[PDB]
Assembly symmetry: D2
Homo-oligomer: 453 residues x 4
């Protein structure tokens, strides 16, 4: 046994699964707003001998020897991270070790807050992330609501925008130590200057969690949270089009000096994590280099143009959009006007190889049947889709909604609806014909990555 054999020869069962997943990615219209297609070059680094190295600590201050090269790699990743976001190294630093977005946010809280200290984030149903402190009326869900004390802030339900007035009012009462400015499902730009004004008033730290918009910020196609935030976290796998990982950026130097750097780094290691994933660090450095180029600015501009074109095509077809439209990479569709909920539409669309996700809308009454869908442009933009192609995407979505509207007319419950899509041969024929046309269209576009896996 050498350990130099190929995957296709040594584990045919797993090789076939990898090929099947690649085929799914190539034949579908992937609209999940948080997905993208990582470059072959980044994946070549991800799947490398860097996986083998234990390097707990930080460059020059490791616990083990043999770190000469991973030191150089980690420091290069830091430099490319600051370069990608146009940050002066004397005013900003970055921790490139977080294993994903959720680890990054937990490390920030652990660095800057004591257990049971208070945080405020946008409520999950209103478009925030689990790690912004989510708990429900009946139990504590995110660990960020167990180890810390959270209170959400909300959209203004009439407008679909973050209610900055109510946030200010309730932060004066709750006295958060940290407020999170960032979203998983919000189509508008965040008023970071106002967020900072609230935080300065109540003496809270401002954390911007820019995971969804990070590449747009790097490409300078939307305003940067770094102009107003103390700390900025992100993932590397969304609009940044990298391998799955996290980053934490923090201010350093003169404010009296800043005191984030030592606390942030200590929280990541030794408090929370173990050995870094040097293969992920390397892949991230590759993608960060890509994000610095003119190619990536043009990609990011096309992401916005494509999201806008998707929004307009939906409005032209009588759909409604939460907040009335978009200013970023995604659109929040409200389907209740058309008479079909997001759980139903999501399933019909899945069966024709269009992947989206059901999304709660302002005013929704039940979670099992949310009113909306979240649709994103980053992934398909990476396949060189343009505006006209996203109009075809909406054409196909509308066909699927129409199919769903007929099945809803012949079915009672969410489970009846779902089996009907499989049982009724007349329904599964229309699904099959739509799926074939969907896959013919999607299969025709290029795809980043390896050829077959």
């Amino acid at each position: 046994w050498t350990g130099q054999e190929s995957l296709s020869d040594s584990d045919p069962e797993m090789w076939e699964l990898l090929q099947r997943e690649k085929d799914r990615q190539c034949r579908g219209l992937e609209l999940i707003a948080s997905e993208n297609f990582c470059s072959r070059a980044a994946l070549e680094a991800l799947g490398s001998c860097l996986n083998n190295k234990y390097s707990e600590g930080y460059p020059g201050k490791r616990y083990y020897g043999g770190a000469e090269v991973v030191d150089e790699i980690e420091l290069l990743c830091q430099r490319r991270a600051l370069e990608a976001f146009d940050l002066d190294p004397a005013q900003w630093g970055v921790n490139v070790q977080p294993y994903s977005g959720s680890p990054a946010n937990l490390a920030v809280y652990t660095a800057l807050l004591q257990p049971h200290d208070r945080i405020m984030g946008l409520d999950l149903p209103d478009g925030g992330h689990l790690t912004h402190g989510y708990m429900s009326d009946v139990k504590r869900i995110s660990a960020t609501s167990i180890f810390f004390e959270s209170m959400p802030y909300k959209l203004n339900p009439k407008t679909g925008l973050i209610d900055y007035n109510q946030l200010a009012l309730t932060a004066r009462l709750f006295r958060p130590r940290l407020i999170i400015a960032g979203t998983s499902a919000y189509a508008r730009l965040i008023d970071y200057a106002r967020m900072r004004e609230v935080c300065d008033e109540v003496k809270a730290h401002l954390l911007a969690d820019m995971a969804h918009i990070s590449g747009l910020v790097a490409a300078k196609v939307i305003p940067s949270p770094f102009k107003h935030a103390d700390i900025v976290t992100t993932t590397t796998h969304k609009t940044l089009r990298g391998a799955r990982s996290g980053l934490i950026f923090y201010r350093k130097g003169v404010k009296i000096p800043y005191t984030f750097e030592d606390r942030i780094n200590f929280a990541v290691f030794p408090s929370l994590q173990g050995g870094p994933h040097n293969h992920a660090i390397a892949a991230v450095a590759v993608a960060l280099k890509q994000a610095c180029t003119p190619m990536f600015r043009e990609y990011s501009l096309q992401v916005l143009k494509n999201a806008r074109a998707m929004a307009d095509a939906l409005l032209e077809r009588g759909y409604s959009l939460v907040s009335g439209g978009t200013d970023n990479h995604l659109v929040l569709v409200d389907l209740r006007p058309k008479g079909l909920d997001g759980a139903r539409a999501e399933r019909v669309l899945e069966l024709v190889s269009i992947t989206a996700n059901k999304n709660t809308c302002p005013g929704d009454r039940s979670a099992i049947t949310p009113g909306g869908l979240r649709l994103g442009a980053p992934a398909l933009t990476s396949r060189q889709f343009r505006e006209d192609d996203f109009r075809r995407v909406v054409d196909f979505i509308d066909e699927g909604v129409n199919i769903g509207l007929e099945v809803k007319s012949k079915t009672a419950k969410l489970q009846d609806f779902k089996s009907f899509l499989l049982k009724d041969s007349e329904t599964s024929q229309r699904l099959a014909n739509l799926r074939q046309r969907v896959e013919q269209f999607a299969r025709a576009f290029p795809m980043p990555g390896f050829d077959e896996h």
Copy 2:
């Protein structure tokens, strides 16, 4: 731009860095007990399109659609993890999503304990891990000592073994809700039956963190913690020779056990986000390798190589903490030899021999460890046999003797280290030994890709 360009063309700077790390691995005697050389096959899965897929939730109970294939992959990984450890699904389940070892242990605590509930693990200086609740006299270090309340248990310093008697005595006073049985630096087998007795007496959960020994357990060359533990965590990148990831195994069925829902909920949605499906797949590749006769022979050889290295050090007048080994590693006490582990680790590093300093019970300076931790898994993966490990020990001894000369000529640690670099006479002797070490090491096979 296609995103299909090769790394070698599109990012030369990073490509030469990857090649440099591969060269470093190939030319070294890599004795870090937690390291291994992952197979090309697993690395091919690790760097795949599985990176692209968001799949929050669990097979058949995802937040989103499109998960047909990742569902099959995640379920296959679970099946292969149970098979590698000879586990019946009716008695055991597994969570294959933890991003690493430390995430795995934190998920167990979050799942079973309230904030500030009490845990006991082996103290870090005595061989336990950070995530077993480590804090120092000076401040709280691991988050496992911040969100939970930890009190360590200790070695008997006269034997080098876990002091099960004192663990029993202190557990009755401290009342832990969970006790961790598992080590980062311990060369003997843990008495899991005794740990079970203590846990039963004080009504604590028994967690076995088998990260270091996981490959040996799968290979059935040492006894298994699954006979006595409620929960077992592990990494997949040490003796299991996989990609970097974690696993949480838990009892289920009649005892009914109530671990499964809590464990799975803690990993997601409580602690983690989207799974790293490329990592899950790579782990599944390694787990299948771990079920083969090849891997049992590998693991038997790891044991024999550790024993051979131990016996050679004893022959050269080294002392061993607990007097020997029954697993993949050796704990060397350099104190009698007159050199500490901080000094020895650095001299060895400069001759391409990678180990790490290790505290010894006989230590008089809590700041400067008196020992080294040496492991056989990595070099065994390159087909080293017992005689090769004897030659490793002769190279170590050459380096230790250099260290002793430099100690006689320098005062503080920093002085020692700088002298190794800049004293021309010393650097020449180090260069000679380094060349012999490297040319020896380069001649062995190496798992993975050819050049990266």
Copy 3:
């Protein structure tokens, strides 16, 4: 060797002979009480009968535990006393013992509240109370922008609710809105400085919506509730705390009332009793329990209802006389035993005013008013009727009190015109002879008026 050198200690000596220094101090405090216009809204004058029980051999008895469930024997009499106090507590508030129980051991009001929190909540569970500047109490969860002040904000997680600044009333609408976001496990309805009746029905609505416990802390109003002169919180709360020394006119102590029996049963009783003992307290203060029982029996009488109705009438007379002299009142009036004066329009703050009044033997306390721009210089005064009502003051007597207050306010306005900082104002009251003589004349007139009225308790101590 003769006299006191030839006499052994008995522990039966009178205080006046055995400790002349302390005896002189007690008499001086009695004199201070008799010669002052005592307007602190939380104060009262305890009866001789209750004080005689407070200073009794019941001090000597350790009785950890509860009646019939004690750690030590010899408890037959203290058991009867504690049970009597419980029965008299329930009688005073018209409570069926099949539906309500009472714990009579809390050492004071703050211990009573902490015991409820410890009984029903886990550490760091959430509570909501009226903010301290807005009229709430420390133990309702107070912390400031700069640090945690009450232990109820240390061991538990509090967020305040607020007055509507424009009406001076509790903003029930905002409480409902914020409770939904904060998800409290317990909400406190009760105040230290609030002149209006609390809408306990609305508070129960909010608590029912968000699945919180409703605690009514009726300390200030307890005697008014007992006398049935204002609505009872027991109609809507299932837990009620109080002190025994404010409007109930007893010895310093606390009480915790709780629902019991069929709600499927209530499960307050065992937890609240356990929190008080063994969790928080040690041996009860049986002398205090007995004194409280004496005052509770008094509170059941027609005499006490007539007292409580007079407290309301006197507070209203004080309010009306203030309004006639151009004073502003927070919420525009009073429905209870106290008045909240807003001095800002008159041009004088509550810190300045309380000090002038103090120097003429009128004891009130400065009080934050809605819109105050600075707490060193709060805008108002809190003025209470219970203590002077116990001395048989009637409405015209409270009109005379206001005349004296207004004279003091006028002296303060004159001193403010002559000084800059609060520290200079205060020194001027003492060092300027013109001012000092004006204060002495007003003090003489205040004291001669007050001394003529009867006083509960012993004659001289």
Copy 4:
């Protein structure tokens, strides 16, 4: 109604209860070690107009005016507290507001410790107090085990003394922030120097809770904890013979200053308490002045002699004593070498007007039938009992034990034993005969306080 009517005229029911309790105190042999008989002078202050004054805050730093006289009283009480313990006011301060012992200890923890910080105290079954952190295997019992994290230390079961070696060992592992040296049932002197050594080694605060022994310390008849602890709590109603209350003493001044004073005072008010009980403060001040006198040193010497006389008489009658003897005001009798448990014995004695309490002994296996009794000398010594009188006390105890043995031989369960004492005519006649002799003896001795209440 004037509020000037006497208790006897206005509430005859309560008046009769007070007289019944007074009669019970006069006719019994009160051996509860934490009890005493407070002076009339102290009681006159306790039942005074001082009840009426709200005085939140501290002297010269109050919330409300009118505090001129209560300021003088509180400061006088502080000076008298320092004087009774021979403390230099430039090196020690004292807080006289705690409402009882348990409030005093909770205030110390709240002042010096964060929530969930670690405390160690002597385990309750081994002689410690609830407020030293007690929890059982099954439930958190004391609030000091809920808001803080406690671990007990133990007696050496062979010797009956605190095991200082094991305390040192376990404190190194548990890392307490505070260790309590003080007991509710311990007959020996505590090695405060050794406790301090341990605290200095692990960097814990040493709190001496001297409640039981405070009068013996003030009289200088046993060594003072103030030589080795820098924080000391106590009650005022045990051997100090005052009204029920608490005190917290702390070092102040140059240690770089001590920082106890401001934290302790703030913990008491505003954190934990509300208005002080000025009547109690005054009564405490009266008792403290008494404690400064030669009379009180003679009383305390006699307490020691009487406890030793009682111990000696029990040994001569074949009883065993936990730890082998006594050095203080109490004796821990082990009844197992007589064959009668403490639950049975306590009840027998109660029915013959001798009040003691059952006490767990080393080796006991059931808390429901512990092996012993705790007996104290302070209360009866305050009635002018001398050594021969305590020998008579032991004679009566032994008769009671013998009755208990006879009933034990005729009954099964604890419940049957207890009902036999009341319902067996022969046993009831024997108890009545013993009770009359006990009461005839006890009534002949004087009693501090009022004549009839």
